[PDB]
């Protein structure tokens, strides 16, 4: 829930960004500009694999899916915590201290 | 378009849900419950004129529109949540307050869902507490 609602959140800020430029941006000079955010994503989604249509990756690496239940939560605080300062390893670290207080709630 | 429907849809649930939840053999709890959808509603409807007069200055795409609802929505999708939850069996009087506590318990996950289940346990408990 708090994971996936940050998610919604976070893309709805990428979105902002994403929509705040023109359409008719160099594509080469737009896929610069989502490098980064590229990054980000391949590193977010293989750990989510939301391929819809056909199953699978959902960006990043062959993602097959996203760890379970709060053993996702575990397996994406060892992850943050090895993975960091990066596209996604910062934003994954700024959604775990998020979290945090998600954690702070379960306390 | 139709993702950004879907809050459409609830909300025209919850609209006719208040109207038919208006009628006062339902409860005068209830009447004060249906009382809190209808102000619900109405701040709901301020929202949509203030997206209308958006849509009179031209700020958005589909998306956009969606994403600046997804609040808004949220809440309107909960709402028709407990809206079923409740009418489905008629949850009138302490039953309906039994589940007033239980929904704020079930809202203790997210916050603002278990301040706002508080303080509408609040509201309709007035009468009825």
Redesign the interface.
């Known amino acids: 829930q708090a994971f996936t609602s940050g998610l919604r959140r976070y893309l709805q800020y990428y979105r902002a960004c994403v929509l705040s430029t023109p359409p008719t941006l160099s594509l080469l000079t737009i896929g610069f500009l989502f490098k980064k955010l590229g990054r980000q994503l391949r590193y977010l989604a293989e750990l989510c694999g939301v391929g819809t249509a056909l199953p699978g990756t959902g960006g990043g690496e062959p993602r097959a899916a996203f760890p379970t239940g709060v053993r996702l939560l575990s397996y994406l605080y060892q992850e943050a915590l090895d993975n960091c300062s990066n596209e996604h390893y910062p934003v994954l670290l700024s959604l775990l201290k998020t979290s945090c207080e998600p954690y702070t709630r379960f306390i | 378009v139709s993702r950004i429907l879907p809050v459409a849809a609830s909300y025209s649930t919850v609209t006719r849900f208040i109207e038919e939840k208006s009628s006062f053999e339902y409860g005068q709890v209830n009447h004060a419950l249906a009382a809190a959808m209808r102000t619900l509603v109405k701040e709901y409807l301020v929202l949509v004129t203030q997206l209308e007069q958006l849509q009179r200055q031209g700020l958005l795409?589909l998306?956009?529109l969606w994403?600046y609802i997804?609040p808004a929505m949220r809440s309107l999708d909960i709402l028709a949540s407990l809206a079923t939850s409740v009418d489905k069996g008629e949850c009138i009087g302490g039953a309906t307050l039994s589940l007033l506590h239980d929904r704020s318990f079930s809202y203790?996950?997210?916050?603002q869902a278990q301040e706002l289940c508080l303080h509408l346990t609040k509201a309709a408990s007035t009468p009825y507490f």
């Open positions: 795409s998306q956009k994403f997804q203790t996950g997210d916050s």
